[PDB]
Ligand binder design. Structure first.
Ligand code: MG
Ligand code: ZN
Ligand code: ZN
Ligand code: ZN
Lengths: 115, 49, 446, 54, 32, 47, 59, 50, 28, 258, 59, 66, 463
């Protein structure tokens, strides 16, 4: 009777932000990115891509509660490299890699058919 | 009377539902549903604050 | 207003045996319709998450809400006065997971460490120095678990598989088996964590944490322990199956030899009793001493088989891991599953002769042999004979009846005990009296 | 009366208005066993008549 | 019918392959 | 002008039963009869 | 439905799989539980101790 | 193998040996004490004590 | 002729015949 | 401090499943791509059934349940239609949905087998898997019964419901030889060799490799019949790219607003 | 003054339940007795009464 | 009661194979051979043709009219 | 005799022939004490140590001792007796097709399951119990492990995608009975829509939902506290009609109208309800492993084997050693073997030819570990799990103990008439009882204010 619907896992509600930045106070150059209506799909790749960057001292996400659709990503870089630009670069290069992978897969498929 | 309605009575604002594990909640928390929460009420005094 | 997040309630289970059965909880609404609570708080309530029912009252006055928040609360009710030890302890899969997490042979990479630190509500925000810098930064389970321990705690505990002949000899402060838990400045140094250090026992790590640090500190400690160990269990993983119940094909030979030896011994005892050689043991008649000797022989055989089975297991076995962790099981369970079940006693004796001088129609009259009186020679893995199956059913029925009568008698006993000391209290004159102001003790507990 | 949600996440469901107000109105969903509180403007009357009667 | 014939052929095959039966997980009582 | 049509028990033949009338079929004569499906917008979600 | 083929049973809104043997009172399936008691016309010699008799030949 | 704090045992022993005689915890030992009619009916023997 | 060994299959034919001739609730 | 250059190689291309290999990529990307293959894949399916007369023996909702699981081919229609939630009209418009109809009534003496073939769609290309092998049996009708209804199809993804799950079962596997020791076999000799194992039959598992990253992820995407396998992969990649682009846009707006 | 529970409502929740109920017994001994000899599974119940199927409450 | 449309675990369509399975079992083929002849590799989808009970027939026996 | 019996059905041969021939014999419990019974004919007679060598009879099959609910249990001897008894008691609570002609019956509280599959391993005894024709469960790919933590203290994790595809999705009926009668000379009941004008006593609910005859038509949406029958008794009239119980939210299946023995209009209505399997529903297998679903994950989150096979249920490993239910593991292994082969297996209690080693050897001939363990992957990150999980088919049931039928709340509900205290029972919208033990616990806590509040303020204030 109280089972939630199926659209509340991806669709945003009126007033809820897709992403919110919050600076941490325990250590310098550390912000927690909170994402709404997402799961491990959109956080694990970003975590790994951040791990690739050497200037990122810390990177890792979590799920405050499985039933709640929310994930917090904590990033901490060197003092001469803010975490916002780190997140932006991670997303940009990940998008470029996915586009290149898609192009390679498409050409491989088109060559496989009668070739 | 004594044991039926003086030492053991029936109180309002109660509930009774099955329980399931949930390690993501602290020891002092409790995962109540939405229906029971909306059904019950808490008399709060008004204050300009 | 409706019940909102943050309000104080009183979650309770129907049989309230003792004080640690009605504690306050903070509200947190969730989509689905099922009560939830941390697994650690399951031990006091004695709940089992198998279709149980637990009430939930709600006060209607700031006075009572504050009173419940200050007196009846989970973090405040961690230690009980009945045995001055913690009641909420790790007695689930988290226990076995943490035990395996604190072994000497646990190494984690930067990714895994940084992923686990996210599940820490008291992290200072600084990554600890890895235990192994080169050739690659590798952390250790104990080093990560140290950050979970709050404050500067100091305590010493012993592991379940701690050999007694180790403290006397050398290697006392350096144990080859990674035992002899030693914590200094709230950092795990040696030993493997188990129920002896994390469970509900006097002097446990949680007990020391509560006594030294505040109640909220212990609450955060529990939360961090569970939130880190359960998450790491994903990478580790725990299971159980046939592969964990099979022996090495030589243990079966030893068990069969031991069973045959026991059968020969009991047959010889029966022959001696028949030919009038077994003299009556002091304090008992001939039948009594005969039965006592048979039972002792069977128990010795069962213990030998169980020991042989236990010594033939592998570190990768899951039954042994769960038993040494103490989360759920015991050595006797492994003995019954693999080696041999044992004797199916009823009413503190062997299976009686329901028919005329015999247990069942299959066996012949005057057959006092082991298999003809309840001794189960087979094991749950290799099936059971129908006769021993029936005897085992009889034993289970005995246990069920005992539980039913206990469930009916203990309630009345507790009621009479509570209705005789319901007005006794400690007055402000630092003395224990009753409703009639009659002094019972000049000082509580003398 | 029977209505039909024309906008919002529940677009396409059919239900009967249970409790109506000046702004919102509760409509019980036919398929699912749950009652929601959708805005009145999101509803569209469809009715269920029976022409003929002869 | 096919199950009946399958059972009969399985039984006759089991009777045929009576060379040796050395198995660990099985036992039976032997009184006296 | 709806006379509350019914469906017979075993005959499954339509019958017009009005108020203050016995519950029996137009033929043979039984005592069991069911109703017809409503005319409302029965709409389900294939979920 | 004494020895009636499954055809009629299906036609009579019944199934041949129903075990039967249950009364129908006021449209409710009533079943008689088989009660057990002591066999009659048999001599029993008990040894009740919480009494004045050492043995009792009930019959 | 269980453990119970000695304070509770001592408190029970003193309460059963406070009036000199061994008062029974049953309805025949606690209702004899001069506690009060409203307290005796709670345990047992409601109408009798009233 | 006696049925050595090959008896697991003939053990249940009798049971099938019994349950076919007498039902489960035959006693009532 | 940038991305990598993954490579792709198809080992088997058929009209039911594809077995490709992705090399030089992180495990997280591979697992995410898998979960997108299963969950976030736009596809058309039945989601709104209006039953007018159902005299069958099954429940009224049973018909809708079964109809919801009937796959529909959307090789070139899913990319064109829009989500019904984001539509800017009323009633299921054909521009954002596909109409269906079913009107079967058993008149002859023999029992009918109402299959997916009875679903008469208004659009030509949006039809159940019956083009080119029996049809999905919906229900069985007998002389005297009938089943009249009309339903509409919409675009959705598996995260909402299993009806929008094109992939049957993705066989994701990497590092066939247990070289990275990500799993410890108590008795390696007792386990069989993986299909992609290059190790000979003598050795049980490859030796340990300290400095070794997971690569060569194997895939066996198996299409249910609605969308083609390679089409499923392309749609998943496009959707993941769109999600990343939207996240980047939201992050940029949030940073600019601060 | 007479017995109780002799005729019960047949539980038609599943065929197994119906079969079990139609072939069920009930002893006339008083409910929740202090004794424990009649409840225990006796050796003579071999092939006559199922040694496993039985309630787990007071009965 | 009726053959499902898709396998609960995997998801492959199995509804359109019950009739083919019965036909193959009737002609000469056995179960262990028919299952892989239809195209069922994974063991999770093989229960749908082995565990499924066909109770719709008994339901159809209670024809409403005629 | 065996040959003449195997050709039964066709000609006319039955059990009476065996009884008359002098091969079988009925021995009662009183005579069984004076006969040398034997278990098996071959094993216990060949030639060995002289035990008795005077057997008079021989049992048919040892497993025949089991009853009805115990017979369906596969490998009962491989489990401890209490768990066998728990399964035997829980079997009667399993849902499913309880009778083929369920659509004709109008019983109260009837449950039916959509897709009641058959156990992959069937004992030779259930062939006559008729279980295979009317099963009460579905074979699920169960993986015994602790994936997340929501399945630790006797709980499971079901697959959301599986439930979406119709995994253990059952239905819930609820029939009603109500008829008119001549109460008195002036009092009289009659079916009629209680309008807003003539009827004085009336409820604050919707009435135009039903037709003019006063009976709600089939296939109409209803919810809690909704009128189902248009009964009105003349005193002008009083709405003496019943309403759907709170928290039911169903749909009307069919409406039946007839005459009772007295001759008055008698009608029955049943309301169905598609109960989607949600967390809190009680499940159980055939070995006593009860539990309630804690959380449900989608397919993308659940683990998976080397191929696309995600577990459907995940029980706690810790429930095995304490309870000693090796029979469950044997059942899972044999089910995996059967699924790989493609035919139902045998789980007879006593067979002398079904051990673990032979089954394991068979399973090793299909590319799977002889012990049934397999390598999974973390559904979140995609990393292999260190411990080889044990996954395989297993037959599970579903009990009727739904969470929606047990959930209850209260906020100053109706009060009794004798003692002005809340009602009792979920149906009557009553409050829970604050037992004396709760009072003693509160006294122990010393919270006198909370105790007095619960006993006076929210129980029965009065001056
Ligand atoms: Mg329990
Ligand atoms: Zn008529
Ligand atoms: Zn549109
Ligand atoms: Zn499958």
């Amino acid at each position: 009777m109280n089972a939630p619907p199926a659209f509340e896992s991806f669709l945003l509600f009126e007033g809820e932000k897709k992403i919110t930045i919050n600076k941490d106070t325990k250590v310098p150059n550390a912000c927690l990115f909170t994402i709404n209506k997402e799961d491990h799909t959109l956080g694990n790749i970003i975590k790994s891509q951040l791990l690739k960057d050497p200037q990122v001292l810390f990177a890792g996400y979590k799920v405050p509660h499985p039933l709640e659709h929310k994930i917090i990503i904590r990033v901490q870089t060197t003092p001469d490299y803010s975490p916002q630009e780190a997140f932006t670069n991670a997303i940009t290069d990940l998008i470029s890699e996915l586009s290149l992978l898609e192009e390679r897969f498409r050409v491989a498929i088109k060559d496989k058919q009668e070739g | 009377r004594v044991r039926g309605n003086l030492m053991g009575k029936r109180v309002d604002f109660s509930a009774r539902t099955v329980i399931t594990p949930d390690p993501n909640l602290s020891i002092d928390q409790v995962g109540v549903p939405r229906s029971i929460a909306a059904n019950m009420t808490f008399a709060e005094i008004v204050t300009p604050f | 207003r409706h019940m909102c997040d943050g309000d104080i309630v009183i979650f309770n289970r129907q049989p309230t045996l003792h004080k640690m059965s009605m504690m306050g909880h903070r509200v947190r609404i969730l989509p689905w319709s099922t009560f939830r609570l941390n697994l650690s708080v399951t031990t006091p309530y004695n709940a089992d998450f198998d279709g149980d029912e637990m009430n939930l009252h709600l006060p209607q006055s700031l006075e009572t809400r504050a009173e419940i928040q200050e007196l009846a609360m989970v973090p405040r009710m961690i230690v009980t006065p009945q045995s001055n030890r913690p009641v909420m302890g790790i007695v689930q899969d988290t226990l076995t997971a943490v035990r395996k997490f604190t072994k000497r042979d646990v190494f984690l990479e930067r990714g895994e460490v940084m992923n686990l630190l996210m599940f820490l509500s008291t992290w200072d925000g600084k990554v600890p120095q890895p235990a192994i810098l080169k050739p690659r930064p590798l952390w250790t389970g104990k080093q990560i678990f140290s950050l979970i321990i709050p404050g500067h705690i100091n305590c010493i505990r012993t592991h379940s598989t701690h050999p007694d002949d180790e403290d006397s000899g050398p290697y006392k402060h350096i144990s080859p088996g990674d035992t002899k838990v030693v914590v200094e400045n709230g950092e795990l140094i040696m030993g493997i964590l188990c129920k002896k250090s994390l469970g509900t026992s006097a002097g446990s790590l949680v007990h020391i944490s509560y006594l030294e640090m505040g109640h909220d500190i212990t609450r955060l400690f529990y939360s961090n322990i569970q939130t880190v160990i359960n998450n790491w269990l994903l990478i580790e993983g725990h299971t159980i199956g046939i592969g964990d119940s099979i022996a090495d094909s030589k243990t079966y030979q030893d068990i069969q030899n031991t069973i045959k030896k026991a059968k020969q011994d009991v047959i010889e005892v029966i022959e001696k009793a028949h030919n009038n050689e077994l003299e009556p043991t002091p304090g008992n008649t001939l039948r009594q001493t005969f039965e006592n000797q048979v039972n002792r022989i069977l128990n010795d055989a069962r213990d030998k088989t169980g020991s042989s089975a236990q010594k033939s297991l592998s570190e990768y076995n899951n039954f042994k891991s769960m038993v040494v962790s103490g989360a759920k099981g015991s050595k006797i369970n492994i003995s019954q599953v693999i080696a041999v079940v044992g004797q199916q006693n009823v009413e503190g004796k062997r299976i009686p002769f329901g028919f005329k001088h015999r247990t069942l129609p299959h066996f012949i009259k005057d057959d006092y042999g082991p298999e003809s009186r309840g001794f189960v020679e087979n094991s749950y893995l290799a099936g059971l004979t129908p006769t021993e199956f029936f005897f085992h059913a009889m034993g289970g029925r005995e246990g069920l009846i005992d539980t039913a009568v206990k469930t009916a008698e203990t309630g009345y006993i507790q009621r009479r005990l509570i209705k005789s000391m319901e007005s006794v209290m400690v007055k402000y004159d630092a003395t224990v009296r009753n409703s009639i102001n009659q002094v019972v003790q000049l000082r509580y507990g003398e | 009366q029977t209505v039909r949600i024309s906008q919002g996440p529940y677009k396409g469901y059919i239900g009967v208005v249970k409790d109506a107000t000046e702004s919102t109105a509760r409509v019980e969903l036919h398929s699912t066993c749950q009652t929601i509180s959708v805005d009145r403007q999101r509803l569209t009357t469809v009715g269920s008549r029976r022409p003929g009667g002869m | 019918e096919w199950n009946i014939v399958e059972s009969e052929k399985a039984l006759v095959a089991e009777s045929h392959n009576m060379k040796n039966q050395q198995m660990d997980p099985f036992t039976r009582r032997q009184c006296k | 002008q709806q006379p509350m049509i019914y469906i017979c028990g075993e005959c499954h033949t339509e019958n017009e039963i009005k108020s203050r009338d016995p519950i029996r079929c137009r033929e043979c004569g039984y005592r069991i009869m069911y109703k017809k499906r409503t005319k409302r917008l029965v709409v389900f979600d294939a979920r | 439905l004494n020895g009636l083929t499954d055809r009629d049973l299906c036609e009579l809104n019944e199934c041949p799989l129903d075990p039967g043997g249950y009364f129908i009172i006021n449209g409710s399936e009533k079943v008689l539980i088989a009660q057990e008691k002591m066999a009659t016309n048999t001599v029993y010699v008990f040894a009740k101790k919480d009494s004045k008799y050492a043995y009792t030949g009930e019959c | 193998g269980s453990y119970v704090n000695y304070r509770h045992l001592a408190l029970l022993c003193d309460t059963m040996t406070c009036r000199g005689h061994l008062m029974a915890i049953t309805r025949h030992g606690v209702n004899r004490q001069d506690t009060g009619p409203l307290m005796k009916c709670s345990f047992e023997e409601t109408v009798d004590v009233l | 002729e006696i049925t050595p060994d090959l008896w697991q299959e003939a053990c249940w034919i009798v049971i099938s015949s019994y349950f076919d001739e007498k039902g489960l609730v035959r006693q009532q | 401090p940038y991305a990598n250059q993954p490579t792709v190689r198809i080992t088997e291309l058929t009209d039911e499943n594809v077995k490709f290999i992705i090399e030089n990529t992180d495990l997280a990307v591979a697992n995410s791509i898998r979960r997108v293959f299963i969950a976030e894949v736009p596809i058309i399916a039945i989601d709104w059934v209006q039953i007018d007369a159902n005299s069958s023996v099954l429940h009224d909702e049973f018909i809708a349940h079964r109809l919801g699981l009937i796959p529909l081919t959307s090789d070139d229609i899913v990319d064109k239609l829009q989500y019904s939630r984001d539509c800017t009209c009323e009633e299921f418009c054909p521009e954002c949905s596909v109409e269906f109809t079913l009107d079967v009534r058993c008149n002859e003496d023999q029992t009918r087998h109402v299959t997916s073939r009875d679903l008469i769609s208004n659009s030509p290309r949006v039809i159940p898997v019956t083009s080119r092998q029996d049809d999905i049996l919906i229900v069985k009708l007998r002389k005297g019964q009938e089943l009249r209804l009309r339903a509409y199809a919409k675009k959705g993804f598996g995260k909402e419901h299993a009806k929008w799950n094109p992939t049957a079962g993705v066989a994701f596997e990497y590092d066939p030889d247990n070289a990275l020791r990500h799993t410890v076999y108590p008795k390696p000799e007792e386990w069989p060799k993986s299909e992609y194992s290059e190790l000979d039959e003598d050795e049980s598992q490859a030796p340990y490799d300290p400095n070794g990253k997971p690569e060569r992820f194997y895939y066996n995407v198996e299409s249910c019949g609605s969308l083609r396998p390679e089409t499923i992969v392309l749609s998943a990649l496009s959707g993941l790219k769109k999600k990343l682009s939207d996240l980047q846009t939201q992050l940029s707006h949030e940073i600019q607003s601060d | 003054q007479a017995r109780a529970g002799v005729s019960q409502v047949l539980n038609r929740l599943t065929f197994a339940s119906t079969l079990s109920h139609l072939r069920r017994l009930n002893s006339p001994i008083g409910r929740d007795g202090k004794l424990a000899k009649p409840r225990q599974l006796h050796n003579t119940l071999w092939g006559m009464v199922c040694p496993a199927e039985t309630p787990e409450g007071h009965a | 009661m009726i053959i499902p449309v898709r396998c609960f675990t995997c998801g492959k369509i199995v509804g359109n194979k019950w009739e083919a399975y019965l036909g193959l079992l009737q002609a000469e083929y056995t179960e262990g051979d028919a299952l892989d002849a239809l195209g069922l590799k994974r063991y999770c989808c093989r229960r749908m043709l082995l565990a499924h009970v066909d109770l719709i027939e008994k339901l159809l026996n209670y024809a409403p009219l005629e | 005799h065996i040959d003449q019996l195997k050709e039964r059905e066709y000609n006319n041969y039955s059990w009476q022939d065996l009884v008359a021939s002098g091969v079988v014999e009925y021995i009662d419990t009183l005579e069984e004490e004076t006969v040398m019974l034997a278990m098996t004919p071959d094993d216990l007679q060949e030639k060995e140590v002289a035990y008795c060598s005077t057997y008079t009879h021989c049992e048919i099959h040892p497993s025949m001792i089991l009853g009805v609910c115990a017979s369906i249990i596969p490998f009962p001897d491989h489990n401890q007796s209490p768990r066998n008894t728990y399964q035997s008691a829980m079997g009667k609570q399993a849902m499913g097709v309880y009778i083929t002609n369920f659509h004709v019956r109008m019983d109260t509280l009837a449950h039916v399951l959509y897709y009641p599959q058959k156990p992959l391993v069937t004992t030779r005894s259930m062939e006559y119990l008729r279980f295979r024709e009317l099963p009460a469960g579905i074979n699920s790919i169960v993986a015994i492990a602790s994936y997340t933590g929501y399945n630790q203290e006797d709980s499971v994790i079901m697959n959301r995608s599986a439930v979406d595809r119709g995994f253990f999705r059952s239905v819930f009926y609820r029939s009603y009975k109500e008829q008119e009668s001549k109460k008195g000379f002036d009092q009289e009941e009659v079916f009629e829509k209680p309008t807003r004008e003539t009827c004085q006593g009336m409820r604050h609910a919707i009435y135009d939902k039903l037709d003019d005859d006063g009976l709600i038509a089939p296939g109409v949406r209803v919810s809690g506290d909704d009128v189902i029958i248009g009964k009105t008794v003349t005193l002008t009239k009083r709405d003496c009609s019943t309403f759907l119980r709170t928290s039911e939210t169903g749909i009307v299946d069919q409406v039946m109208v007839t005459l009772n023995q007295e001759g008055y209009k008698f009608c029955k209505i049943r309301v169905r309800s598609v109960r989607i399997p949600q967390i809190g529903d009680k499940f159980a297998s055939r070995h006593g492993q009860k539990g309630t679903c804690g959380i449900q994950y989608r397919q993308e989150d659940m683990p998976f084997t080397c191929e696309g096979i995600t577990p459907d249920i995940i029980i706690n490993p810790h429930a095995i050693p304490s309870r000693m239910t090796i029979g469950h593991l044997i059942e899972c292994l044999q089910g995996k073997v059967s699924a790989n082969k493609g035919e139902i297996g045998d789980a007879t209690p006593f067979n002398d030819a079904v051990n673990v080693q032979k089954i394991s050897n068979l399973l090793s001939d299909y590319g799977y570990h002889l012990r049934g363990n397999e390598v999974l992957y973390n559904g979140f990150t995609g990393r292999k799990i260190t411990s080889q999980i044990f996954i395989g088919p297993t037959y599970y049931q579903r009990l009727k103990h739904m969470v929606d039928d047990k959930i209850h709340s209260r906020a100053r509900g109706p009060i009794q008439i004798l003692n002005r205290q809340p009602m009792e029972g979920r149906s009557r919208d009553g409050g829970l009882r604050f037992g004396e033990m709760e009072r003693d616990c509160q006294i122990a806590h010393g919270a006198a204010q909370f105790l007095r509040e619960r006993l006076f303020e929210a129980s029965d204030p009065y001056q």
